[PDB]
Design an enzyme around this catalytic site. Structure first.
Site, PDB file in Angstrom:
ATOM      1  N   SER A  28       0.852  -1.190   0.000  1.00 28.87           N
ATOM      2  CA  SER A  28       0.000   0.000   0.000  1.00 28.87           C
ATOM      3  C   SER A  28       0.889   1.241   0.000  1.00 28.87           C
ATOM      4  O   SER A  28       1.942   1.255   0.643  1.00 28.87           O
ATOM      5  CB  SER A  28      -0.913   0.012   1.232  1.00 28.87           C
ATOM      6  OG  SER A  28      -1.773  -1.118   1.254  1.00 28.87           O
ATOM      7  N   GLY A  29       0.473   2.275  -0.736  1.00 30.51           N
ATOM      8  CA  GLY A  29       1.268   3.504  -0.876  1.00 30.51           C
ATOM      9  C   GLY A  29       0.482   4.785  -0.664  1.00 30.51           C
ATOM     10  O   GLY A  29       0.767   5.803  -1.308  1.00 30.51           O
ATOM     11  N   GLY A  32      -4.318   3.972  -2.043  1.00 33.39           N
ATOM     12  CA  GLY A  32      -4.389   2.834  -2.968  1.00 33.39           C
ATOM     13  C   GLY A  32      -3.476   1.663  -2.651  1.00 33.39           C
ATOM     14  O   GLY A  32      -2.498   1.800  -1.906  1.00 33.39           O
ATOM     15  N   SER A  33      -3.811   0.508  -3.231  1.00 34.54           N
ATOM     16  CA  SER A  33      -3.040  -0.726  -3.076  1.00 34.54           C
ATOM     17  C   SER A  33      -2.523  -1.174  -4.434  1.00 34.54           C
ATOM     18  O   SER A  33      -3.176  -0.955  -5.447  1.00 34.54           O
ATOM     19  CB  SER A  33      -3.916  -1.831  -2.501  1.00 34.54           C
ATOM     20  OG  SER A  33      -4.558  -1.395  -1.324  1.00 34.54           O
ATOM     21  N   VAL A  34      -1.368  -1.834  -4.438  1.00 34.32           N
ATOM     22  CA  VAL A  34      -0.725  -2.260  -5.670  1.00 34.32           C
ATOM     23  C   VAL A  34      -0.463  -3.768  -5.672  1.00 34.32           C
ATOM     24  O   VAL A  34       0.012  -4.340  -4.678  1.00 34.32           O
ATOM     25  CB  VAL A  34       0.607  -1.504  -5.894  1.00 34.32           C
ATOM     26  CG1 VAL A  34       1.225  -1.906  -7.217  1.00 34.32           C
ATOM     27  CG2 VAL A  34       0.389   0.023  -5.845  1.00 34.32           C
ATOM     28  N   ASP A 164       4.305   9.085  -8.463  1.00 32.45           N
ATOM     29  CA  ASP A 164       3.592   9.923  -7.473  1.00 32.45           C
ATOM     30  C   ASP A 164       3.786  11.427  -7.686  1.00 32.45           C
ATOM     31  O   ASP A 164       3.668  12.212  -6.741  1.00 32.45           O
ATOM     32  CB  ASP A 164       4.007   9.561  -6.029  1.00 32.45           C
ATOM     33  CG  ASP A 164       3.611   8.140  -5.608  1.00 32.45           C
ATOM     34  OD1 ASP A 164       2.696   7.525  -6.197  1.00 32.45           O
ATOM     35  OD2 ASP A 164       4.224   7.632  -4.636  1.00 32.45           O
TER      36      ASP A 164
END
Ligand SMILES: CNC(=O)c1ccc(C)c(-n2c(C)cc(OCc3ccc(F)cc3F)c(Br)c2=O)c1
Ligand SMILES: Fc1ccc(-c2c[nH]nc2-c2ccnc(F)c2)cc1
EC number: 2.7.11.24
Length: 337
Positions: A28-29, A32-34, A164
């Site tokens: 997670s960043g 959102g999640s990747v 980002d």
């Protein structure tokens, strides 16, 4: 429409087209999640980002729109771009989830600075690439604002992309004028951050490990000196000046001594990037032309961005309007083919 399939990964539900297989959470960043995945259509390893609560509020809805707009715009080797964008929703009323897809890189600059100690040659190539991406982003009138090692994705090829933009302890790489709360900062905010990152890659330590906003300023000023008269004249804030001018005055240090064993070209670039007065700081384009990057620099291969419409940033719109604008942008997406 493609066929979607559904699964749960770490409490989070993921509904993605069958073309993307073997999803694996890669962290997670914030917002959102990747997952890493395999794209059966291309043969590529991809990262799929599921936005968290994209329409929770006007702020989130506007942020979701901004990120989609930014990502659809960025087409550059050193900037994260879009391979695909999709929603399982089949109409606007059903629309509540946004998935974004890019080429998987699989590491970041923290994952490279840590325990491994880079040669000057690797430093040249990594920083060249950041500056090459920044030239492009800055040419679209976009400022990253939070450049740090964890926002710099690096693959096994040592190829780097900025993540980002325009949207691990971030304050360490923040420009001093931002720590002071100045609202009229310029793009060289990002050049400060590059200088901090480059210093860290050269030395193996955080240049300015501040514990809060005030401690961060103090650490910066001990290297670069307290403001001279020309810069002091430019500070409107009485409270800000009271503080700065109340600190014990410090001279700018000798960078050749602080970075003692580094390439003297690296030291020279560092002092041009880490100038306190942001009006005197080197730009990304200027830095690319610095002799430190002689082995990499090619003006014919450092592209600028197409015009980017940022006018939406000034607008005060309803959640449903931001939502419909985002839906429009998902449906109009044309992949890099
Ligand atoms: C943990 N190991 C990893 O695989 C690993 C390690 C470090 C990083 C930065 C990453 N990593 C992450 C988090 C996000 C990422 O992209 C996020 C992202 C951005 C835009 C978009 F449209 C789709 C995305 F998905 C990539 Br591309 C990447 O490569 C993976
Ligand atoms: F202690 C300081 C003093 C000034 C800066 C600074 C660097 N570039 N620009 C500024 C600046 C310009 C105008 N107004 C401001 F508030 C800040 C940063 C730290």
């Amino acid at each position: 429409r493609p066929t979607f399939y559904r699964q749960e990964l770490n409490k989070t539900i993921w509904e993605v087209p069958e073309r993307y297989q073997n999803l694996s959470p890669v962290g997670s960043g914030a917002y959102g999640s990747v997952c890493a995945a395999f794209d059966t259509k291309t043969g590529l390893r991809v990262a799929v980002k599921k936005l968290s609560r994209p329409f929770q509020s006007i702020i989130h809805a506007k942020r979701t729109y901004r990120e989609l707009r930014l990502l659809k715009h960025m087409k550059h080797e050193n900037v994260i771009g879009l391979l695909d964008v999709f929603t399982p929703a089949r109409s606007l009323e059903e629309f509540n989830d946004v998935y974004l897809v890019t080429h998987l890189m699989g590491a970041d600059l923290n994952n490279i600075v840590k325990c491994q100690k880079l040669t000057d040659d690797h430093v040249q190539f990594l920083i060249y690439q950041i500056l090459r991406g920044l030239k492009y982003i800055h040419s679209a009138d976009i400022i990253h604002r939070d450049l740090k090692p964890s926002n710099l994705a690096v693959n096994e090829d040592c190829e780097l992309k900025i993540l980002d933009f325009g949207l691990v302890a971030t304050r360490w790489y923040r420009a001093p004028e931002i720590m002071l709360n100045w609202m009229h900062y310029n793009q060289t905010v990002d050049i400060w951050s590059v200088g901090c990152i480059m210093a860290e890659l050269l030395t193996g330590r955080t240049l300015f490990p501040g514990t809060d906003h005030i401690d961060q300023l103090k650490l910066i000023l001990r290297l670069v000196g307290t403001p001279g008269a020309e810069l002091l004249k430019k500070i409107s804030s009485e409270s800000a000046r009271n503080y700065i001018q109340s600190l014990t005055q410090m001279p700018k240090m000798n960078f050749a001594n602080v970075f003692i064993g580094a390439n003297p070209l690296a030291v020279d670039l560092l002092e041009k990037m880490l100038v306190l007065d942001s009006d005197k700081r080197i730009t990304a384009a200027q830095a690319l032309a610095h002799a430190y990057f002689a082995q990499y620099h090619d003006p014919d291969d450092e592209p600028v961005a197409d015009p980017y419409d940022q006018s939406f940033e000034s607008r005060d719109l309803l959640i449903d309007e931001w939502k419909s604008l985002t839906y429009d942008e998902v449906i109009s997406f044309v992949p890099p083919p």
